């Protein structure tokens with residue numbers, strides 16, 4: 001949408017209201033751990049064919065090592081993302097966080113595989129030995145992974161930064177948000193005066209999460225395209241057995257039945273040359289595809305150390321807006337974050353001035369912006385409109401009133417003067 | 422015996438990739454199913470020849486009724502005893518179970534970590550009294566080996582006719 | 584291990600490459616010297632070409648994994664350059680980027696085909712428990728701390744920094760006033776010392 005907001009050299013727009021927004025973000029961490037056996041696949045339990053494969057050197061020694069290097073790596077990728085806490089913290093038995101509910105994300109003491117109320121939905125929107133192909137099971141089961149997210153999340157609501165910097169310390173949540181507010185340059189007096197309103201916004205934003213995850217038909221597209229690619233690359237591998245590759249018959253068994261060894265060996269080599277070359281294609285595809293997952297498994301590793309275990313000043317990564325934290329959530333083959341950010345709203349305009357003339361000396365603001373509501377001038381913080389009387393407690397003196405342009409005339413009240421009288 | 426219902430004309434059954442899934446009896450006309458004998462990867466768990474010569478063989482995804490035998494989600498361990506303790510596991514088997522050399526090879530349910538609980542009251546804070554400086558190393562690979570191969574040297578081998 | 588594996592993987596992928604020259608690929612002999620003096624040249628190309636298409640295919644493979652493995656190093660070399668630019672030539676506020684704890688500085692050390700850092704961090708220890716309060720009333724006005732936390736040991740309220748004990752008597756310069764204290768939930772009364 002086209003927009004054009006008016007700009008003036010002595011005009012500033014300071015927001016007067018905030019709006020807490022919770023935005024999800026889905027990343028893939030690991031994929032299926034496949035493994036292929038050549039003799040069962042290429043040969044097919046044929047002793048005559050097994051001797052022919054020896055002529056091709058050691059092509060399948062590496063083809064089992066290549067599919068194993070990207071098999072232990074997947075179990076490694078899950079380690080950095082989740083296993084970043086030495087000790088498994090536990091939720092306190094009494095939930096009194098000053099109005100914040102957290103029941104939508106905390107573990108649920110109910111039917112087994114004790115996941116959260118949101119993790120249950122995420123496990124429903126994403127949801128074998130035939131010849132050589134197998135599927136190895138992951139080292140970290142979904143039950144154990146859910147405990148890792150039930151230790152980071154269950155502790156970050158009580159300590160904050162302290163997990164990444166030694167033994168955990170106790171801070172009430174009603175006071176922890178004051179730390180978060182002060183990070184974005186907003187004084188803590190805003191929080192305590194608006195605890196009830198913020199808690200309602202915090203709970204309402206989380207409530208819309210599972211009501212929007214279920215509303216959209218496909219919200220897990222990032223985590224589903226990974227599964228589709230793996231299934232598509234595995235289905236095509238099996239169909240390669242139904243191709244002759246230049247031989248009389250696609251199936252290797254009947255060739256030995258009706259052909260002499262002097263002639264069968266000539267045409268079996270067509271199958272072995274084709275099938276072996278048809279297997280190295282997927283191995284190279286997997287190696288490139290695995291490198292595209294580790295590039296995202298490392299992005300989520302940092303986004304769990306920086307967004308979760310602390311407040312990140314990086315703009316527009318830990319959610320869009322002024323970032324505070326991010327409650328991590330499990331996923332079948334990935335991680336789902338819940339970034340809690342601030343989006344200012346309800347804007348108002350004022351006329352500004354870089355300095356103030358009082359007794360021939362400039363008065364720049366110590367912390368805040370000079371604004372006026374039309375007649376009188378005030379000092380307000382950057383991200384929230386709170387006017388205060390201009391005194392020496394929030395201004396400093398430097399230079400002379402002849403070097404910087406745009407100064408207005410006003411009197412800075414000295415708080416010490418009325419005390420003497 | 423074939424679970425599926427067939428017809429008296431089709432003899433051979435195929436599912437995917439020219440696999441003879443079902444085959445019809447030519448005399449009794451009782452159509453059956455053909456499946457090969459169960460397969461399984463033989464994974465050898467060893468603590469190294471330097472320590473000792475002992476092996477806990479694991480067969481991939483087969484119950485312990487068709488092969489101290491222990492049954493796991495990834496298969497069955499034969500040669501290792503399962504103990505109800507839980508340590509930071511040594512040899513990663515899979516499905517939340519590992520092995521270690523300690524009456525030699527023992528299978529665990531690996532522990533995530535030392536469980537801790539902290540009380541958090543709305544009017545309680547904890548501020549440290551002291552600091553502890555520490556130096557933690559970190560190792561990263563920067564460069565590789567600058568290899569180079571003469572392609573003609575390989576395939577031909579100083580042979581003009583080749 | 585992160586530096587030993589890269590040396591071993593390249594040395595092993597190269598070692599398993601040379602061993603591929605002793606494979607028949609269907610020819611009578613795996614060595615090209617004897618196949619020349621034993622076969623007549625109209626009959627020679629059909630058997631040599633088997634080695635041509637077999638050795639070339641092997642060479643085409645290991646070149647590909649070198650390209651893939653080089654991406655695993657370049658991606659790990661841009662990260663190393665980031666560590667040198669940020670943690671060594673400055674102080675980084677990123678959490679757990681350069682060590683468990685709060686970062687101070689790093690010392691880079693050389694290594695064969697790699698680099699080793701020495702991250703110096705803080706791990707606060709020996710914590711002691713207290714009762715706290717978000718604000719303090721005084722003459723019908725709230726009092727929020729400029730920098731620190733209101734901390735009491737049972738009798739008197741102090742103001743201490745978030746990572747150490749600097750308990751000073753609460754004064755008008757350690758706190759800032761923000762309206763009447765009727766909306767703050769859980770405020771505890773105390774007398775704010777006037778230093779004037």
Ligand SMILES: *[C@@H]1O[C@H](CO)[C@@H](O[C@@H]2O[C@H](CO)[C@@H](O)[C@H](O)[C@H]2NC(C)=O)[C@H](O)[C@H]1NC(C)=O
Nearest residue numbers: 003004005006007011012013346347348349350
């Ligand atoms: C505050 O911001 C601007 C300052 O005037 C006002 O926006 C006007 O409407 C559009 C953009 O929203 C511009 O084309 C105009 O130039 C703006 N200025 C006008 C009409 O004078 C906006 O209305 C102001 N809002 C308040 C409450 O003061």
Ligand SMILES: *[C@@H]1O[C@H](CO)[C@@H](O[C@@H]2O[C@H](CO)[C@@H](O)[C@H](O)[C@H]2NC(C)=O)[C@H](O)[C@H]1NC(C)=O
Nearest residue numbers: 016017018019020193194197200201344345346
């Ligand atoms: C703007 O700030 C005010 C209060 O700081 C908010 O107004 C409240 O809105 C809710 C419902 O929307 C009401 O239940 C309250 O009674 C209102 N309070 C007052 C004093 O009127 C408002 O939510 C904020 N606007 C935005 C977009 O965040």
Ligand SMILES: *[C@@H]1O[C@H](CO)[C@@H](O[C@@H]2O[C@H](CO)[C@@H](O)[C@H](O)[C@H]2NC(C)=O)[C@H](O)[C@H]1NC(C)=O
Nearest residue numbers: 094095096097099100101102103104105203207
């Ligand atoms: C957190 O969630 C809701 C907020 O609406 C609170 O009330 C529950 O709402 C659900 C309906 O979705 C009911 O099925 C429950 O019976 C309600 N009670 C409980 C204990 O779940 C809920 O109380 C809040 N949790 C708290 C305050 O601990």
Ligand SMILES: *[C@@H]1O[C@H](CO)[C@@H](O[C@@H]2O[C@H](CO)[C@@H](O)[C@H](O)[C@H]2NC(C)=O)[C@H](O)[C@H]1NC(C)=O
Nearest residue numbers: 371372373374375376377378379386387388389
């Ligand atoms: C906005 O500027 C006006 C002055 O034009 C101020 O509002 C008046 O301030 C006097 C105090 O000197 C009061 O007695 C009046 O009741 C106010 N009138 C109105 C309509 O508000 C005021 O200083 C400024 N508004 C602030 C600081 O909120």
Ligand SMILES: *[C@@H]1O[C@H](CO)[C@@H](O[C@@H]2O[C@H](CO)[C@@H](O)[C@H](O)[C@H]2NC(C)=O)[C@H](O)[C@H]1NC(C)=O
Nearest residue numbers: 356357358359360361401406407408409410411
């Ligand atoms: C702001 O204040 C200064 C001084 O208080 C004003 O400077 C005066 O400007 C007029 C016209 O040039 C001179 O005749 C006076 O001599 C100046 N005052 C003094 C004490 O020398 C200045 O004009 C004021 N500017 C605005 C925008 O109000």
Ligand SMILES: *[C@@H]1O[C@H](CO)[C@@H](O[C@@H]2O[C@H](CO)[C@@H](O)[C@H](O)[C@H]2NC(C)=O)[C@H](O)[C@H]1NC(C)=O
Nearest residue numbers: 713734735736737738739740741750751752753
């Ligand atoms: C809490 O800390 C204060 C500061 O030390 C203690 O107050 C002092 O206690 C000593 C004796 O232990 C007295 O000599 C001082 O006169 C006290 N100073 C003030 C300003 O009161 C206080 O005793 C401590 N409370 C507890 C329970 O240990």
Ligand SMILES: *[C@@H]1O[C@H](CO)[C@@H](O[C@@H]2O[C@H](CO)[C@@H](O)[C@H](O)[C@H]2NC(C)=O)[C@H](O)[C@H]1NC(C)=O
Nearest residue numbers: 719720721722723724764765769770771772773
């Ligand atoms: C903290 O705030 C004030 C301290 O004066 C106390 O409330 C006032 O005093 C009496 C009771 O002490 C109340 O009936 C009045 O409503 C209050 N008056 C004013 C002007 O605020 C309050 O009791 C103190 N709280 C505690 C736990 O001691």
Ligand SMILES: *[C@@H]1O[C@H](CO)[C@@H](O)[C@H](O)[C@H]1NC(C)=O
Nearest residue numbers: 008009010353354405406407
């Ligand atoms: C803004 O522009 C007007 C027009 O030139 C000028 O009078 C005024 O001094 C300027 N103020 C600042 C701060 O530049």
Ligand SMILES: *[C@@H]1O[C@H](CO)[C@@H](O)[C@H](O)[C@H]1NC(C)=O
Nearest residue numbers: 540545546710711712713714
């Ligand atoms: C005292 O400190 C311990 C931990 O060091 C904590 O378990 C306990 O809750 C604290 N008691 C009070 C009243 O703060």
Ligand SMILES: *[C@@H]1O[C@H](CO)[C@@H](O)[C@H](O)[C@H]1NC(C)=O
Nearest residue numbers: 094096542543544768769770
């Ligand atoms: C803290 O929680 C308890 C609930 O047992 C409550 O009685 C008390 O008033 C709360 N303290 C504050 C300052 O809200």
